[PDB]
Design a protein around this ligand. Structure first.
Ligand SMILES: O[C@@H]1[C@@H](O)[C@H](O[C@@H]2CO[C@@H](O)[C@H](O)[C@H]2O)OC[C@H]1O
Ligand SMILES: O[C@@H]1[C@@H](O)[C@H](O)OC[C@H]1O
Lengths: 341, 348
């Protein structure tokens, strides 16, 4: 039996790959410096390649191997994630910064529902994922709703798979840090019916955004025990989805009171008029989060300046790092506790 | 820029792996006969390894590569399944025998819900998957319920992932071949809270007792379920076919449609006393008003003789069943076939 990864008491991590045939086995992982920082495993006489890295800071880290030039996952690690077409293994180093990302056996767990709905706007049925809080079943309580949008290359599975949304929400809700809430994760690619690993291509500017308001929101409010109205609605998205969030809220002032723009910036006289209408809409939070090293940083500054021009109040969270799921998990973790308060 | 697998118009399939630095790439796949059936890809002078196999009969086939002694999936194939800890790619050769396994864009799709429930019997909360038929949302109709159980090594994700349950049910229901129904896929491992790829380990007869005392009431409370035996079906494969027998034998009159896939006689205590209890349970079930007892098994399965022993014992009791013998053995290919044939029989 081969243990890989093996997390040590000092948060070093050992990885192992067996092969007497292979010449070179490397590992690519999210703790590394960059492409030049790929690391080579050391082969012993027995055929075992191994490497120990770290100590690593608490976080979720994805990785894979490369065996004589071919990508290979870690067959001894059952934890596998998917980012579009890119599959990688992962592990989580325990500690304060990663604690919300674990699936804990002593925490009540919310349901994840993969549900299809008709779309009058797009013209074919589409799939979304809906998280409901623990204890939703068997009760009559109604809950506010948070619409959570992915970026380019993603799909309705991404926020749970890459973003650990079910764990983050289970843990925040159980800890009393976020209110119980329904989280709705749409597929933001209007040409798709659902995630490409399960749903084939179907045999469009503005259509996703229009469909969220005209098709998704009514379906959620009809088919789930949802509170209604702007103070019970939140919306956030990353990158492309942060653009969707702006378009949706700019075009529908007074529909969402909690608005989050993750790793995205600006995308006219119409623009200024829509800011003025949104400014007067009674919103409660406009939260902009971006990493200092993200290529979109300057565009996010332009967004902030454009809001400043209108004396439009927002909160800005600048973080370390760049355009990564590590940052998007952090942003979700910080934004969800702000909602519906 | 690399297509792999490339399914050709004649149902041959080409696989490709690129690396100038690799020495040997082989492929392991379900069209092969045994471990000595692994096949070597041929390397061209530009670093592309390739092989063309087939023609293959219509079916879903899983596969992976081995690169210089290390398992590797096909990075150009987004279709990946999981059997416990074993991940493999797959593809589906179109044709009559595989058509139900495709996700079709012109077919209404049922919801798959991953829901947690308290278990008084097991003592901690557990996860199951529930399929509801297309159009469940937004309507008031109630639906009969089919409990579908996996075997050893599986979990509540297996029947949808390995078994293509959502596609089979969507397609059968849309074609009018099976009635709209709720399909409940439990985790049959009483020591687990949920599937090992998502849920960590937790700090007998318990599964079977919990299905009746915890799962069924939760489904009937929280889903729009018709109830009573004529609205209730249960089937399972291997270990889950054993669970199916134990549950139905211990609760005669609770299920009208019973499916035993790739499983035979249950082990028991003296040999005679076991047979007396077994006889009594057969007789009570015989008189229970059930509608269908369906036994399906591959002729090459190790369990074949035990399933024959079961059939012979039922014959001795004049207990009416239907037997479906198939080609092949103890495989998800057969379990998909069995689901595809059993679901159209239910609730009619
Ligand atoms: O899930 C997607 C991420 O994978 C994507 O990340 C970008 C991918 O291309 C690289 O060149 C960029 O550096 C990297 O940020 O971001 C969008 C998200 O939807
Ligand atoms: O891998 C198979 C498993 O999925 C099933 O549960 O029992 C038989 C095994 O061969």
């Amino acid at each position: 039996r081969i243990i890989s990864p093996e997390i040590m008491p000092d948060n070093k991590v050992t990885f192992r790959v067996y092969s007497k045939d292979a010449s070179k086995v490397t590992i690519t992982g999210e703790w590394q410096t960059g492409p030049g920082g790929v690391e080579e495993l050391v082969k012993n006489d027995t055929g075992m390649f191994s490497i120990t890295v770290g100590p690593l800071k608490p976080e979720l880290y994805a990785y894979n191997f490369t065996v004589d030039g071919v990508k290979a996952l870690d067959a001894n690690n059952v934890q596998v994630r998917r980012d579009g077409t890119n599959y990688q293994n992962f592990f989580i180093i325990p500690g304060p910064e990663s604690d919300l990302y674990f699936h804990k056996n002593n925490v009540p767990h919310g349901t994840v529902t993969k549900v299809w709905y008709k779309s009058s706007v797009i013209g074919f049925d589409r799939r979304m994922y809906v998280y409901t809080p623990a204890g939703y079943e068997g009760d009559t309580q109604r809950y506010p709703v948070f619409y959570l949008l992915h970026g380019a290359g993603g799909d309705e599975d991404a926020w749970t798979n890459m973003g650990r949304t079910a764990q983050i929400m289970d843990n925040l809700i159980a800890q009393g840090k976020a209110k119980p809430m329904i989280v709705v994760m749409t597929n933001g690619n209007a040409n798709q019916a659902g995630a490409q690993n399960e749903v084939p291509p179907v045999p469009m500017t503005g259509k996703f955004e229009e469909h969220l308001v005209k098709d998704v929101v009514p379906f959620i409010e009809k088919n789930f025990r949802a509170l209604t109205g702007k103070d019970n609605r939140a919306i956030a998205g990353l990158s492309m989805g942060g653009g969707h969030t702006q378009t949706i809220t700019n075009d529908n002032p007074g529909m969402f009171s909690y608005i989050g723009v993750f790793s995205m910036g600006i995308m006219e006289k119409e623009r200024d008029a829509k800011i003025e209408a949104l400014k007067k809409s009674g919103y409660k939070l406009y939260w902009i989060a971006c990493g200092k090293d993200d290529f979109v940083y300057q565009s996010a500054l332009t967004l902030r300046n454009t809001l400043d021009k209108h004396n439009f109040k927002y909160v800005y969270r600048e973080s370390t790092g760049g355009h990564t799921w590590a940052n998007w998990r952090i942003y979700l973790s910080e934004f969800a506790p702000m909602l519906f308060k």
